[PDB]
Amino acid sequence: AKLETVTLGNIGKDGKQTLVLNPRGVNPTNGVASLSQAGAVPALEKRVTVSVSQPSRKNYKVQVKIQNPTACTANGSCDPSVTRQAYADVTFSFTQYSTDEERAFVRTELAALLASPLLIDAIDQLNPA
Amino acid sequence: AKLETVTLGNIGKDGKQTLVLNPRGVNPTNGVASLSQAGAVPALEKRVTVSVSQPSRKNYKVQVKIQNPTACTANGSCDPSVTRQAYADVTFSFTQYSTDEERAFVRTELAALLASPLLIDAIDQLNPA
Amino acid sequence: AKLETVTLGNIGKDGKQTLVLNPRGVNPTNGVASLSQAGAVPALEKRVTVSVSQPSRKNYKVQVKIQNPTACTANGSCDPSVTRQAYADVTFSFTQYSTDEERAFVRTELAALLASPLLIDAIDQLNPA
Amino acid sequence: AKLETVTLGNIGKDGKQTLVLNPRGVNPTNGVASLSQAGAVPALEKRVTVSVSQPSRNRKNYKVQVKIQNPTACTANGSCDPSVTRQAYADVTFSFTQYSTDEERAFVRTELAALLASPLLIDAIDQLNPAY
Amino acid sequence: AKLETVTLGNIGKDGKQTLVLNPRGVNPTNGVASLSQAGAVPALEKRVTVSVSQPSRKNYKVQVKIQNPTACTANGSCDPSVTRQAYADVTFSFTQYSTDEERAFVRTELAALLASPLLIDAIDQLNPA
Amino acid sequence: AKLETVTLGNIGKDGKQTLVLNPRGVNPTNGVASLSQAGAVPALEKRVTVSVSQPSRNRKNYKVQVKIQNPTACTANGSCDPSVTRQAYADVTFSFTQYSTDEERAFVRTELAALLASPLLIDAIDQLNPAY
């Protein structure tokens, strides 16, 4: 669709957060759209980069990269810097004949594991299975 | 945590689906756990493979691969075969000092985009941004 | 005992089946008896091969192999062919001093697990433990 | 399924026995689950080890493999703690091609679960008489 | 048993401490379970690793390793680092015929020396005997 | 401190036991102290060997190392003097960097002295159940 201010709601371990993402245009060299938090220091922005790569491999590759840096202001300078860069990547794939449901069943599945008690115990605490 | 029957609920484009995933043991050669649908043809099972790779790169890599094949029974044989293999991949990353929140804020974020009107228009229909 | 038409009754996931096995003589090169279904295409017969190997290792090895092929007629040809070959193997073992009970307690045990809710969930659906 | 206390009932040549098997966790190095009798001497326990080996780059076939194992204790010896004299193994290694349907499996289970009670094997195991 | 939040109570030289250890899954390559403090910097976590190695040597080896790092923040940097790594190891052993009591008498013994006035004078102050 | 009769109390799975350990001198070749039960057959004694190894030119870390050892006596045999059948060892090898404070040590002692009584180990030692 058209890039708009995605108001991601109810995020965070407690589930009471917000995250607005202003659009940031489509980098035309690789078709990678981008979003970003309104945080007005553009090396400390929660970035989100969606994209779709049409067959050139014969498979659509919806690829959502998000990226959350953390700012460690304290001691010795004034402008905060980037200490930890907590990436996160999602690279779907779909054969040319992938129906409408066989896709929206991989989306909501991966959108349901990431809230199931198997992953919030395998990401929020890095406990393996 | 411990692998159990993850009863992923309310999936699918319409939002009225279920998907139970019986545990399938931890492949010890690479620490990759696995889940699978109760669908009793084990080349037609909706597979899900979580894993966590401790620092050996100095970054934890929670990597959730899911995989949904589709079965095209009709014409000419009896046992259905695998026609389309609609993959989906998620490879997080976290620096050794990644706090508890800086992780559970990348999980629920990626678990909220995949339900936001930006991706269900960029996956369910492959419309780019 | 003497090979006879073993009328295996109440088989199958539903428990309402029959399976008659006509004797098929004792292959003398290795003492391996054999049974077989009355299905009159002798490359599509549910085979069963019992045997006992006296000490030559100092341990009796009762070894029951059964074997169920499936016939996929719809092909392009007339005579059905063997597509899947669903083996199954049982190799007991008993020390020379194995009493009468210490054997008939390994038989009926293995004959009770294969009907317990631990295996008909670990064979009929390949769910591991 | 989930490992639980499998209360195997009606076992033994006479058919009047019980055998409870407490779960014993999944050895993670090879995915081999394990059960065991409540017999509280852990070198004299009737062990049972189920497992399922998913297709890897060595074979494309599921291998449900149930090993059971019954040792016998010969106390009267000269010592106090009983020892393991005879180790009456028993092995079951199924196999199923990737396309093995639900019935083509539960028909190999209950078959092998019906021979082991048919008058052909309880005369070829309980007495080691071969087939003749 | 099943890994759970072990709430180790009444620890420390004064005896008024707590230490909760969230489970951290069973590393399947070597069967070594793991616990960890809720301290949300996963290179500064009080780790505890239990394990049991079945006969492959003919002796069970219950092996409990615990490990307490200390964080020296004041440095010149922002993210604290690991200065001292105060290990501690316990490797039991038991012959295949080890009864139930002959084990729970080595546990509680070693669990009673470590509180007797012989060791809290040979660990808390490194005074030899 | 000084080796004395350590009267370890409230031991055993039931928690109602005693175990007195008379001192047994410091083997000077390696600085390994030793204790022992008053059981007056000195190949059937519950041994306990503490030691501290100061930093040498092989490692810069104190290594408090407590080995205990409980043999069991199987009299009934054919002979008169009981013999050693099972040798149920147990080992504890701490470690501490030269700058290890007083608390960072007495917090590893009482921790390891609290796990060995927590419901995670008395289910992973008294029954050898691994963690699952």
CSV table of N, CA and C in Angstrom, one decimal, chain A residues 1 50-53 60-65 90-95 98-111, chain B residues 13 66 68 86-90 110 112-129:
chain,number,residue,atom,x,y,z
A,1,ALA,N,0.8,-1.2,0.0
A,1,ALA,CA,0.0,0.0,0.0
A,1,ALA,C,0.9,1.2,0.0
A,50,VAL,N,10.7,-2.4,4.8
A,50,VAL,CA,9.9,-3.5,4.0
A,50,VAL,C,10.4,-3.4,2.6
A,51,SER,N,10.1,-4.4,1.8
A,51,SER,CA,10.4,-4.5,0.4
A,51,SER,C,9.8,-5.7,-0.2
A,52,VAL,N,9.6,-5.7,-1.5
A,52,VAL,CA,9.2,-6.9,-2.3
A,52,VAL,C,10.0,-6.9,-3.5
A,53,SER,N,10.6,-8.1,-3.8
A,53,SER,CA,11.5,-8.2,-4.9
A,53,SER,C,10.9,-9.2,-5.9
A,60,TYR,N,8.9,-14.3,-5.3
A,60,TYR,CA,8.7,-13.1,-4.5
A,60,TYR,C,9.4,-13.2,-3.2
A,61,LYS,N,10.0,-12.2,-2.7
A,61,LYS,CA,10.7,-12.2,-1.4
A,61,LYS,C,10.3,-10.9,-0.6
A,62,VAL,N,9.2,-11.0,0.1
A,62,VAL,CA,8.9,-9.9,1.0
A,62,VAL,C,9.9,-10.0,2.1
A,63,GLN,N,10.6,-8.9,2.4
A,63,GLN,CA,11.7,-8.9,3.3
A,63,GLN,C,11.6,-7.7,4.2
A,64,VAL,N,11.1,-7.9,5.5
A,64,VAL,CA,10.9,-6.9,6.4
A,64,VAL,C,12.1,-6.9,7.4
A,65,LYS,N,13.0,-5.9,7.4
A,65,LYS,CA,14.0,-5.7,8.4
A,65,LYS,C,13.6,-4.6,9.3
A,90,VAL,N,13.1,-10.5,8.7
A,90,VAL,CA,12.1,-11.4,8.3
A,90,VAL,C,12.1,-11.4,6.7
A,91,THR,N,12.4,-12.5,6.2
A,91,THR,CA,12.5,-12.7,4.7
A,91,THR,C,11.5,-13.8,4.3
A,92,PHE,N,10.3,-13.4,3.9
A,92,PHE,CA,9.4,-14.4,3.4
A,92,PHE,C,9.8,-14.9,2.0
A,93,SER,N,9.0,-15.8,1.5
A,93,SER,CA,9.3,-16.2,0.1
A,93,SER,C,8.0,-16.8,-0.4
A,94,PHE,N,7.7,-16.7,-1.7
A,94,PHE,CA,6.5,-17.2,-2.2
A,94,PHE,C,6.7,-17.5,-3.7
A,95,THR,N,6.3,-18.7,-4.1
A,95,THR,CA,6.4,-19.1,-5.5
A,95,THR,C,5.4,-18.3,-6.3
A,98,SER,N,1.8,-18.6,-5.7
A,98,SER,CA,1.3,-18.6,-4.3
A,98,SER,C,0.0,-17.8,-4.2
A,99,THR,N,-1.0,-18.6,-3.8
A,99,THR,CA,-2.4,-18.0,-3.7
A,99,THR,C,-2.4,-16.8,-2.7
A,100,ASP,N,-3.6,-16.2,-2.6
A,100,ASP,CA,-3.8,-15.2,-1.6
A,100,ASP,C,-3.8,-15.7,-0.2
A,101,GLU,N,-4.4,-16.9,0.0
A,101,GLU,CA,-4.4,-17.4,1.4
A,101,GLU,C,-3.1,-18.0,1.8
A,102,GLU,N,-2.5,-18.8,0.9
A,102,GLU,CA,-1.2,-19.4,1.3
A,102,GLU,C,-0.1,-18.4,1.7
A,103,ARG,N,-0.4,-17.1,1.4
A,103,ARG,CA,0.5,-16.0,1.9
A,103,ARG,C,0.0,-15.5,3.2
A,104,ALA,N,-1.3,-15.0,3.2
A,104,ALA,CA,-1.8,-14.5,4.5
A,104,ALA,C,-2.0,-15.5,5.5
A,105,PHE,N,-1.5,-16.8,5.3
A,105,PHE,CA,-1.4,-17.8,6.3
A,105,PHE,C,0.0,-18.0,6.8
A,106,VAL,N,1.0,-17.5,6.0
A,106,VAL,CA,2.3,-17.4,6.5
A,106,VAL,C,2.6,-16.1,7.3
A,107,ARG,N,1.9,-15.1,6.9
A,107,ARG,CA,2.0,-13.8,7.7
A,107,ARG,C,1.5,-14.0,9.1
A,108,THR,N,0.2,-14.3,9.2
A,108,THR,CA,-0.4,-14.4,10.5
A,108,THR,C,0.1,-15.5,11.4
A,109,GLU,N,0.6,-16.6,10.7
A,109,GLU,CA,1.3,-17.6,11.5
A,109,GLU,C,2.5,-17.0,12.2
A,110,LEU,N,3.5,-16.5,11.4
A,110,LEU,CA,4.6,-15.8,12.0
A,110,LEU,C,4.3,-14.6,12.9
A,111,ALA,N,3.1,-14.1,12.6
A,111,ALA,CA,2.6,-13.0,13.5
A,111,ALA,C,1.9,-13.6,14.8
B,13,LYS,N,-6.2,-15.0,6.6
B,13,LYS,CA,-6.7,-13.7,6.1
B,13,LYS,C,-8.0,-13.3,6.8
B,66,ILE,N,9.6,-20.8,9.5
B,66,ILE,CA,8.3,-21.6,9.3
B,66,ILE,C,8.3,-21.9,7.9
B,68,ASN,N,5.3,-23.7,4.9
B,68,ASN,CA,4.0,-24.2,4.6
B,68,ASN,C,4.0,-24.8,3.2
B,86,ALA,N,5.9,-22.5,0.4
B,86,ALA,CA,5.8,-21.1,0.8
B,86,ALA,C,6.6,-20.9,2.1
B,87,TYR,N,7.9,-20.7,1.9
B,87,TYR,CA,8.7,-20.5,3.1
B,87,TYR,C,8.4,-19.2,3.9
B,88,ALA,N,9.1,-19.0,5.0
B,88,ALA,CA,9.1,-17.8,5.7
B,88,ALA,C,10.1,-17.8,6.8
B,89,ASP,N,10.9,-16.8,6.9
B,89,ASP,CA,12.1,-16.8,7.8
B,89,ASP,C,12.1,-15.6,8.7
B,90,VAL,N,12.7,-15.8,9.9
B,90,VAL,CA,12.8,-14.7,10.8
B,90,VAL,C,14.2,-15.0,11.6
B,110,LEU,N,8.0,-6.7,15.5
B,110,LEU,CA,7.8,-7.6,14.4
B,110,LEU,C,6.5,-8.4,14.5
B,112,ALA,N,3.8,-7.0,15.5
B,112,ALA,CA,2.8,-6.0,15.2
B,112,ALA,C,2.8,-5.5,13.8
B,113,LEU,N,3.9,-5.4,13.2
B,113,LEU,CA,4.0,-5.0,11.8
B,113,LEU,C,3.2,-6.1,10.9
B,114,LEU,N,3.5,-7.3,11.2
B,114,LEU,CA,2.9,-8.4,10.4
B,114,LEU,C,1.4,-8.5,10.6
B,115,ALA,N,0.8,-7.6,11.4
B,115,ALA,CA,-0.6,-7.4,11.4
B,115,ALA,C,-1.0,-6.0,11.1
B,116,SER,N,-0.1,-5.1,10.8
B,116,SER,CA,-0.4,-3.7,10.4
B,116,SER,C,-0.8,-3.6,9.0
B,117,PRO,N,-1.6,-2.6,8.6
B,117,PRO,CA,-2.1,-2.5,7.3
B,117,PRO,C,-1.0,-2.1,6.3
B,118,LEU,N,0.3,-2.1,6.7
B,118,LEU,CA,1.4,-2.0,5.7
B,118,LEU,C,1.9,-3.3,5.2
B,119,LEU,N,1.9,-4.4,6.0
B,119,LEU,CA,2.4,-5.6,5.5
B,119,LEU,C,1.3,-6.5,4.9
B,120,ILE,N,0.1,-6.6,5.5
B,120,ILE,CA,-0.9,-7.4,5.0
B,120,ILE,C,-1.4,-6.8,3.7
B,121,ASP,N,-0.8,-5.7,3.3
B,121,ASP,CA,-0.9,-5.3,1.9
B,121,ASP,C,0.4,-5.4,1.1
B,122,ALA,N,1.5,-5.8,1.8
B,122,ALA,CA,2.8,-6.1,1.2
B,122,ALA,C,3.2,-7.6,1.3
B,123,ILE,N,2.3,-8.4,1.8
B,123,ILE,CA,2.5,-9.9,1.8
B,123,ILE,C,1.3,-10.5,1.1
B,124,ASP,N,0.1,-10.3,1.7
B,124,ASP,CA,-1.1,-10.9,1.1
B,124,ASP,C,-1.4,-10.5,-0.3
B,125,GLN,N,-0.7,-9.5,-0.8
B,125,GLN,CA,-0.9,-9.1,-2.2
B,125,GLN,C,0.4,-8.7,-2.9
B,126,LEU,N,1.5,-8.9,-2.3
B,126,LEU,CA,2.9,-8.6,-2.8
B,126,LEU,C,3.0,-7.1,-3.4
B,127,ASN,N,2.1,-6.2,-3.0
B,127,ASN,CA,2.2,-4.8,-3.4
B,127,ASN,C,3.4,-4.3,-2.6
B,128,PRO,N,4.4,-3.8,-3.4
B,128,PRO,CA,5.5,-3.1,-2.7
B,128,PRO,C,5.0,-1.8,-2.0
B,129,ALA,N,6.0,-1.0,-1.4
B,129,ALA,CA,5.6,0.2,-0.7
B,129,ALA,C,5.5,1.4,-1.7
